[PDB]
């Protein structure tokens, strides 16, 4: 991994950009000639191969986090997989040519980068990245970071450990599909229950749920069964708190949190991906892609429109970029 020839790295590239806050159908535009970000000393420049979309991308573009956002215009996209083309002078973990993946923004809602992953090149902190598992495609790898790390962190915060039961509210989405898998296959849960609509129950069971609950036909909080952990990925802590055992833990990723539930926002860390590497290599934990993925780089507005419908099963990925 010797330095790339310097004239081989472009200073402008194609990207999607918004210059004002609003709906993606209104504000998100393609720009054929946007600056490539200059790297800091603890960053690498990545040739982007694929990018995933997350709800945070559209909530951020609506201006929900404006008070702690970076300056507009913004190139959206948190999740990235691609190939290192340049390394900063303080970088030790990666070299030119490494295949890497991660969620660009250490603190999702505080100073996310101006130069996201929906571009041909992006700059990423060493600390947020991991080596791409060899058995995963770039589409599959791009799908993982924000959602898998959110799932992992929430389960750790809930103190999930071997033998305990957990209920997942929103089991079929980007995050919930990993909450199920991790709970069963990484945290050793004895029983994993999860909510989704009628046609998605079989998927939940396939991913590791012992009990798939159709929220369109019954209310989980009225079940007499109560859980050691409840992980809300929808935004219904009012009910979630009614499903937990005395002394158990309720976490949510969608506030506001009704005590005793807690709301957190993930911290993006490559070390979490590295910890999960063996489960990804063995296929014990798998990427989960929406059947509509991948969306070509020309179809980013449509990819966002589909994610904004709240119906995605697993991940919406953009490729090729
Ligand atoms: N605080 C943090 O750190 C983070 C917060 N988030 C937030 O978490 C939420 C989920 O994110 P993500 O998984 O990426 O979202 P997705 O858009 O991937 O979730 C879509 C899934 O949500 C399911 N869903 C919708 N309503 C319900 C319901 N009432 N009960 C059960 N399932 C339901 C749908 O299944 P169906 O079609 O069957 O309804 C669909 O499969 C978002 O609001 C996101 O902003 C995400 C990541 C990090
Ligand atoms: C990543 C993330 C979201 O999606 C939120 O809603 C809050 O933080």
UniProtKB/Swiss-Prot annotation:
One of its GO terms (molecular function) is furaneol oxidoreductase activity. Belongs to the zinc-containing alcohol dehydrogenase family. Quinone oxidoreductase subfamily. InterPro entries: ADH-like_N, AOR-like, GroES-like_sf, NAD(P)-bd_dom_sf, PKS_ER, Quin_OxRdtase/zeta-crystal_CS. Coiled coil: none annotated. Monomer. Its EC number is 1.3.1.105. It catalyses: 4-hydroxy-2,5-dimethyl-furan-3(2H)-one + NADP(+) = 4-hydroxy-5-methyl-2-methylenefuran-3(2H)-one + NADPH + H(+). Keywords: NAD, NADP, Oxidoreductase. SMART domains: PKS_ER. Substrate binds at residue 59. It holds the Pfam family ADH_zinc_N_2. This is 2-methylene-furan-3-one reductase. Enone oxidoreductase involved in the biosynthesis of 4-hydroxy-2,5-dimethyl-3(2H)-furanone (HDMF or furaneol), the key flavor compound in strawberries. It comes from Fragaria vesca (Woodland strawberry). NADP(+) binds at residues 59, 174-175, 197-200, 215, 253, 264-266, 311-312.
């Amino acid at each position: 991994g010797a330095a790339a020839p310097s004239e081989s790295i472009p200073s402008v590239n194609k990207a999607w950009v918004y210059s004002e806050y609003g709906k993606t159908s209104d504000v998100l535009k393609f720009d054929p000639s946007v600056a490539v970000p200059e790297i800091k000393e603890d960053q690498v420049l990545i040739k982007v191969v694929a990018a995933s979309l997350n709800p945070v991308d559209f909530k951020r573009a609506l201006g929900y986090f404006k008070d702690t956002d970076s300056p507009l215009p913004t190139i959206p996209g948190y999740d990235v997989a691609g190939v290192v083309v340049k390394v900063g002078s303080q970088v030790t973990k990666f070299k030119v040519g490494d295949e890497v993946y991660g969620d660009l923004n250490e603190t999702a809602l505080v100073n996310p980068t101006r130069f996201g992953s929906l571009a041909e090149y992006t700059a990423a902190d060493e600390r947020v990245l991991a080596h791409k598992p060899k058995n995963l495609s770039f589409i599959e790898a791009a799908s993982l970071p924000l959602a898998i790390e959110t799932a992992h962190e929430g389960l750790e915060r809930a103190e999930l450990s071997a033998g305990k039961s957990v209920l997942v509210l929103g089991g079929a989405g980007g995050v919930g599909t990993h909450i199920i898998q991790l709970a069963k296959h990484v945290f050793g849960a004895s029983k994993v229950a999860a909510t989704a609509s009628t046609k998605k129950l079989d998927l939940l069971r396939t991913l590791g749920a012992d009990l798939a609950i159709d929220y369109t036909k019954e209310n989980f909080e009225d079940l007499p069964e109560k859980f050691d952990v409840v992980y809300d990925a929808v935004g219904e802590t009012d009910k979630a708190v009614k499903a937990v055992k005395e002394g158990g833990k309720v976490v949510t990723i969608v506030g506001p949190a009704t005590p005793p539930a807690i709301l957190f926002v993930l911290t993006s860390k490559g070390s979490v991906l590295e910890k999960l590497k063996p489960y990804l290599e063995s296929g014990k934990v798998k990427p989960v892609l929406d059947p509509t993925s991948p969306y070509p780089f020309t179809k980013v507005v449509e990819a966002f429109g589909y994610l904004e419908s709240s119906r995605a099963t697993g991940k919406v990925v953009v490729y090729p970029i």
